[PDB]
């Protein structure tokens, strides 16, 4: 499809964000509105690699 929900979403994100990890990196930030904002769009609407990449950490 064009959407991702549940564990397939989580597995896809883990693979996409490699060793960097999630931007939303702590239990408390995974419950955040910003996190949910991205997740609700992927699941309910459309999810693409660009949207997914916004979910990743951005270390130097």
């Amino acid at each position: 499809s064009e959407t991702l929900c549940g564990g397939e979403l989580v597995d896809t994100l883990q693979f996409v964000c490699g060793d960097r990890g999630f931007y939303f990196s702590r239990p408390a930030s995974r419950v955040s509105r910003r996190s949910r904002g991205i997740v609700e769009e992927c699941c309910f609407r459309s999810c693409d690699l660009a949207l997914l990449e916004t979910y990743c950490a951005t270390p130097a």
Partner: antibody
Amino acid sequence: EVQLLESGGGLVQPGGSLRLSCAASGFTFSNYIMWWVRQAPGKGLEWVSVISSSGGMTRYADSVKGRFTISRDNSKNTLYLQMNSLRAEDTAVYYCARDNGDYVGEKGFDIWGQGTMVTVSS
Amino acid sequence: QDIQMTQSPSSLSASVGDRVTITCRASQSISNYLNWYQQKPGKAPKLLIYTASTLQSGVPSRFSGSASGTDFTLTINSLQPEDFATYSCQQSYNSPWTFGQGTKVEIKR
């Protein structure tokens, strides 16, 4: 005491309309993605509908698309399922349920309504 | 294409204090995203276990879950009389977050 208290089930003729309500208490309702799940007589549980936490996005099982509408009113701490063009095969116990996780359904549904029966019959 | 869930056995009868083993299979790969619910007759299900082995809070330690290759098992160590219920698995990988049909556990007293 976290609680989902459902109301609104009953008897309705084929082609008819019913609206279920699920009133939440003991938690911050607006943080949670909410679910409708049904159980038809001698069948398994099945997803009906899901709504995001704000309410602005929704998703439906194929069997109900175009006919049911889920919504929520965060101000009143309540979840709704509007059931139209009701068919006999929609007869079931209807549960509301809260999302246990963060990625829409990835850790199951932790908190459940008590169930409300919906009978579609002449 | 929608993932189908299969349990074994569909029912069992076991004695208080026994170890009970219930299997769930997915027809496609669900990673480790498998939940267990306990449903007593005419009641809302109760979440026991999510992500194959994570016990939900308030749930007795006698309930445990395992991935078992490409199988999943719920274990009830020390079956109790309260445990009489249907135990159902649910894949949490994708839509439609499909529930299995359940395994009826009877207490052999």
